[PDB]
């Protein structure tokens, strides 16, 4: 288990004297110190942890308990020290929610203008300076940066800088070049702000609002997540308001655990975040839908989870459905002990903690902070209304060939002109040469005379792997500019859930070599297929999605790799079951010839699992895995028997 994470407070040997610093790059550690920032890599053990940036909506495990239970961070309280700027008078402890920014607006701060809600993407700000001789001027920060910002600051600058400023008041000075002004900064203001206007409560207003109309802009400060960070430059409010800078921080947050216990005031040093949560782990409040092969044909039936025993891998979910008439919901049931593997994130209706949501056509905004037991999303705020509402109206913000190519298989609707047809056929002949020479085991392919570009491929699971036995079928087309660009691959799903982090049910497969996560003209279909059977079905299908190698050798990596191996087993069983029922016309006989032994071998292996160094991480079997695998195995046996292929 690594101990440091992103944005944690660390104390280290910067210049002999221990200096605090925030860590930025986290091995996928790098620290920047408080007084003078020198971003640098430091040994994790050597660095001393002081605070954690456990921000809301963050998934975290307790750092001392033997239970690896995960939970969601609802609210956070930061007790922070503050120093008056330019002085070492440090006030401590103070709470973050009392400090304020300097500028009235900042990148992203929600704004509501003339019945239009938007994010300030880019804005131009001023500095109003008071001069030694009593002159107040407005200097655009483009020049203000030249002065050697916050209320009360004292700068000095050559008079030339004040050539383009606007002298609001006082004796306009003589801009001599042989001496410099000394200026105080009374205020920092906003000149004009650019907005995106993503949505609203007919046409959007202009992308930029200037001072002439900026008075219409009212800031939605209710949606503040600008939780104090070490070195953040704020306005202290006395218990008179002054300018301060944070010195040290202590984050204590409320974490809703999977078992459903809401534990409050947890020092963040006993909690550490989860970078890579398995897709199936449902924390309480998720909106999820049953996904079993046969159960629940109705799509209007949805579910909200209430607790999941982490070790058990079984989540209890309440099943709701929408009433056909009226903005009401109908309670289906309270089924408990449901395999997470049989549950899937609802395509819509995602409401994490403290998200900003809009009402679908009164209150128009809010912070979704809790998910009700009745599946009603908590928050639609006009001003701290706290009114429960349903998701119904919320928006969250060896080689072979064939004479014809079957219509529904391979690729169609392609009519690109190759640079030279004969050259393209010559490249294709080179490819047949390579394929015939190679592919002694494991892989195989065929193509079609009517469209030499069109190809079909069949790939087999390797041994001692969650994708053991099994079967996989790919359509492919060689671009008419081949080998100028990588070939067009597509893995027919025959399933619904991602059988692999890279294989997509939609069928736009990707791999590292093909450049989509490089490709070259010298590359050949043989290399790509060898990689597909070498990596896309690697021993541990975890990793291979997005630099997840960083978790290699870690406790989290091991646990989530085991879980993903289990889900891969479930969905490969599902994929074979569906493949048997609707084998493509391209390969009808070849599915059966292999399955006649492979399917029963896999079923026997699954049965053995229900009751030894076998090469891939799956032990122990969780209760939910037992249930889901038993169901899918029964379905697979039924399919195999229906296919005229009894026990073998």
């Amino acid at each position: 288990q690594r101990l440091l994470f992103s944005h944690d407070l660390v104390s280290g040997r910067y210049r002999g004297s221990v200096h605090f610093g925030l860590v930025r790059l986290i091995h996928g550690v790098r620290v920047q110190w408080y007084p003078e920032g020198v971003k640098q890599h430091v040994k994790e053990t050597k660095l001393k942890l002081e605070d954690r940036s456990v921000v809301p909506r963050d998934v975290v495990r307790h750092m001392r308990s033997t239970d690896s239970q995960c939970g969601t961070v609802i609210d956070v309280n930061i007790d922070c020290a503050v120093k008056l700027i330019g002085t070492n008078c440090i006030i401590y402890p103070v709470n973050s929610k009392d400090l304020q920014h300097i500028w009235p607006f900042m990148y992203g701060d929600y704004i509501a203008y003339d019945c239009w809600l938007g994010k300030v993407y880019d804005l131009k700000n001023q500095i109003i300076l008071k001069l030694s001789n009593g002159a107040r001027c407005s200097m655009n920060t483009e020049d203000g940066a030249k002065l050697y910002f916050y209320p009360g600051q004292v700068l000095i600058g050559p008079a030339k800088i004040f050539s383009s400023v606007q002298w609001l008041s006082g004796v306009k000075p003589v801009l001599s070049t042989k001496s410099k002004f000394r200026v105080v900064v009374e205020e920092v203001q906003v000149v004009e702000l650019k907005v995106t206007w993503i949505t609203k409560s007919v046409s959007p207003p202009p992308s930029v609002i200037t001072q002439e109309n900026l008075g219409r802009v009212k800031r939605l400060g209710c949606f503040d997540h600008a939780q104090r960070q070490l070195g953040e430059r704020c306005l202290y409010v006395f218990p008179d308001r002054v300018a301060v800078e944070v010195v040290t921080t202590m984050t204590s947050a409320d974490v809703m655990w999977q078992d459903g216990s809401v534990e409050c005031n947890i020092r963040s040093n006993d909690l550490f975040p989860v970078h890579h949560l398995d897709n199936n782990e449902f924390c309480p409040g998720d909106f999820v839908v049953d996904k079993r092969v046969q159960s629940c044909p109705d799509p209007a039936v949805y579910g909200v989870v209430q607790s999941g025993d982490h070790i058990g891998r079984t989540c209890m979910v309440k099943w709701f459905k929408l009433r056909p008439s009226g903005d009401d919901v109908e309670l289906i049931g309270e089924e408990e002990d449901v395999s997470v593997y049989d549950i899937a994130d609802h395509p819509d209706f995602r409401f994490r903690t403290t998200d900003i949501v809009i009402r679908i056509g009164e209150p128009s905004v809010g912070q979704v902070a809790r998910v009700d037991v009745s599946s009603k999303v908590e928050v639609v705020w006009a001003d701290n209304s706290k009114t429960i509402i349903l998701p119904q109206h919320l928006y969250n913000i060896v080689f072979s060939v064939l004479e014809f190519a079957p219509s529904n298989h391979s690729f169609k609707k392609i009519e690109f002109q190759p640079p030279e047809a004969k050259k393209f056929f010559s490249t294709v002949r080179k490819e047949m040469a390579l394929l015939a020479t190679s592919l002694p085991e494991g892989i195989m392919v065929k193509t079609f005379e009517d469209r030499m570009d069109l190809f079909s491929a069949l790939i087999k699971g390797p041994t001692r792997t969650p994708y053991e036995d099994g079967l996989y079928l790919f359509d492919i087309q060689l671009p008419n500019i081949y080998p100028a660009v990588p070939p067009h691959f597509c893995y027919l799903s025959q399933c619904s859930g991602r059988l692999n982090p890279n294989l997509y049910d939609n069928g736009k497969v990707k791999v590292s070599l093909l450049g989509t996560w490089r490709w070259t003209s010298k590359s050949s279909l043989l290399q790509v297929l060898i990689s597909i059977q070498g990596l896309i079905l690697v021993n541990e299908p975890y990793y291979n999605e997005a630099g997840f190698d960083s978790d290699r050798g870690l406790q989290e990596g091991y646990e989530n790799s085991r879980c993903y191996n289990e889900m891969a087993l479930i969905r490969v069983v599902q994929s074979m079951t569906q493949l048997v029922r609707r084998p493509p016309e391209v390969f009808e006989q070849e599915i059966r010839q292999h399955f006649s032994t492979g399917g029963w071998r896999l079923v026997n292996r699954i049965e053995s699992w229900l009751e030894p160094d076998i090469g891939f991480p799956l032990f122990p079997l969780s209760k939910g895995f037992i249930k889901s695998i038993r169901g899918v195995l029964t379905q697979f046996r039924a399919a195999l028997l229906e296919a005229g292929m009894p026990e073998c």
Partner: protein, 240 residues
């Protein structure tokens, strides 16, 4: 051979520094001639300030200018204003030909209740010459040297000194006798009486710092205030 050539160029720079000393003397000469040219203009300023040519004049012109400038505001105490508003004029005479490079910041005072002097002439002296010790130190008309003036105070009004008191009980009689001592009082007019410099140069750090302050103040009053007094009176001058 290279460093001998640099030394030859060094001697050439020494001779060029002597030539530049001549050039600065000529610059002072041109300043004197253009001071004669100003005499109309500066005299007109002094005349309109003190109601000689057209509330009379410009009340507290020089006290106001000194207050607006930090370098002089820091010096004018609350008890110095009653004296320093009586400054009829400040003006910079320059040394005639042949006399040492110098300029006199003469302070014309109206008949006052504090001292009977008509004018206080805090003469300064430049060095047009590169001294043999460090000729290259001649970055220009440097101001090292000064000559104040002695001001006799009318009874009961002096501000440069103040009386401190102590009391001790007599052992025999038991009377609590009192003793008094005159001690320096923070006053702008102590500007006029700089600490006399010992010949050997044994100047305490206080003397060096106060002399540097006096010298920069004199140079400032020469080049900034008196030539461009108005830019500073109305606040248009930046004054750091």
């Amino acid at each position: 051979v290279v460093k001998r050539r640099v030394n030859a160029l060094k001697n050439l720079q020494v001779k060029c520094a002597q030539i530049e000393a001549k050039f600065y003397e000529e610059v002072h000469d041109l300043e004197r001639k253009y001071a004669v040219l100003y005499q109309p203009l500066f005299d007109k300023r002094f005349e309109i300030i003190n109601a000689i040519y057209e509330p009379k004049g410009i009340p507290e012109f020089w006290l106001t200018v000194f207050k607006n400038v930090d370098l002089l505001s820091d010096m004018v105490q609350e008890h110095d204003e009653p004296i320093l508003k009586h400054l009829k004029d400040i003006k910079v005479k320059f040394s005639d030909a042949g006399q040492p490079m110098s300029f006199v910041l003469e302070f014309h005072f109206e008949p006052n209740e504090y001292f009977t002097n008509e004018v206080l002439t805090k003469t300064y002296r430049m060095r047009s010459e590169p001294d043999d010790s460090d000729p290259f130190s001649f970055d220009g008309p440097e101001i090292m040297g000064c000559t104040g003036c002695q001001i006799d105070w009318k009874k009961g009004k002096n501000v440069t000194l103040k009386t401190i008191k102590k009391k001790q009980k007599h052992k025999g009689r038991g009377t609590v006798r009192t003793v008094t001592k005159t001690v320096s009082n923070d006053s702008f007019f102590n500007f006029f009486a700089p600490p006399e410099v010992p010949e050997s140069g044994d100047l305490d750090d206080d003397a060096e710092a106060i002399l540097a302050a006096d010298f920069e103040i004199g140079h400032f009053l020469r080049e900034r205030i008196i030539p461009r007094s108005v830019l500073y009176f109305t606040g248009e001058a930046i004054e750091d």
